[PDB]
Amino acid sequence: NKTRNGSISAIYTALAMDPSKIFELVKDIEKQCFKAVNDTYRNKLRSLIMNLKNKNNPTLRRSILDHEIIPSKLVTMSAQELAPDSLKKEMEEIYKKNLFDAQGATENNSVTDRFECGKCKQRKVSYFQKQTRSAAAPLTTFCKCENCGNRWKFS
């Protein structure tokens, strides 16, 4: 009966730390204690306890006696949702940052209509030049079509 007394004590205190309702508080945790009866169970407690005494948010312990819906905080799967507001804004902010850093870069380059592709015959092409041949022979131009992806070189 260790938990039968401790789950209560901790619930009572961390739910008062925020007159007659004693039986409504006791009825709720007693239903919640046998609810977790559905060592992995112990891990479920730490979730309930922590979000309550994470003060900062009075709403939770302050908005837990007014009304609420009770059996929801069990198969919740809303650990992101259950308090508090600023955090939710961050997890929505951090997500966009993570979705952005998971992608990759692209290509810039200038396009001119002074060349034509041999495949699709479009006048959108970038280029650059290197010295492939000797010091007597002219430069070598490398062209690339910015439509189909074709590439060619100049003499």
Partner 1 sequence: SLFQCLVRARLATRRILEEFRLNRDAFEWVLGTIEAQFQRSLVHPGEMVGVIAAQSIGEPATQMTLNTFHYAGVSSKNVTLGVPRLKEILNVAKNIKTPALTVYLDREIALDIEKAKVIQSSIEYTTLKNVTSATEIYYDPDPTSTVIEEDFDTVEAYFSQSPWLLRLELDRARMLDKQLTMNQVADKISEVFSDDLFVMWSEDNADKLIIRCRVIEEDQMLKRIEAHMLDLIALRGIPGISKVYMVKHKVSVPDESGEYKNEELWALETDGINLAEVMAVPGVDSSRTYSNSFVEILSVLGIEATRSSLYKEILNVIAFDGSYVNYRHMALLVDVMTSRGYLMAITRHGINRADTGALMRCSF
Partner 2 sequence: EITHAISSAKEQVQEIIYKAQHNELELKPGMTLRESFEGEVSRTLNDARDSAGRSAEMNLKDLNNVKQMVSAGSKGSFINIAQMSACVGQQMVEGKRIAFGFADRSLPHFTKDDFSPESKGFVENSYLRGLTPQEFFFHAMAGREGLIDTAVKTAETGYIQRRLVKALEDIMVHYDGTTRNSLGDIIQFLYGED
Determine if 50 is a binding residue for Zn ion (CB under 5 A).
no
Listed in sequence order, the residues at least 6 apart from 30 whose beta carbon sits closer than 8 Å to its beta carbon are 8
Of the residues 119, 130, 151, 153, which one makes contact with Zn ion according to CB under 5 A: 119
Interaction between residue 16 and partner 1 (CB under 8 A) = no
Taking CA atoms, 82 is separated from 72, 73, 110, in Å, by: 11, 9, 51
Residue 148 assigned ligand-binding role: yes
> Helices 40-52 & 2-14, crossing angle to 10 degrees?
20
Stretch that binds partner 2, among 35-43, 58-66, 86-94, 131-139 (CB under 8 A): 131-139
Say if residues 123 and 111 touch (Cβ distance below 8 Å). Answer: no
- Which of helix, strand or coil describes residue 68? coil
Answer for which of 70, 94, 120, 139 binds partner 1 (CB under 8 A) is 94
Q: Please tell me the distance from the alpha carbon of residue 155 to that of residue 150, in angstroms, as a whole number.
A: 17
Candidate list 26, 31, 47, 138; residue touching partner 1; CB under 8 A = 47
User: Whole-number minimum distance, CB 151 to partner 2, in Å?
Assistant: 17
DSSP 122: -
| List of residues contacting partner 1 (CB under 8 A) | 6-7, 9-10, 14, 43, 46-47, 49-51, 53-57, 79-80, 82-84, 87, 90-91, 94-95, 97-99, 101-105, 128, 130, 132-133, 140, 142-143, 151-154
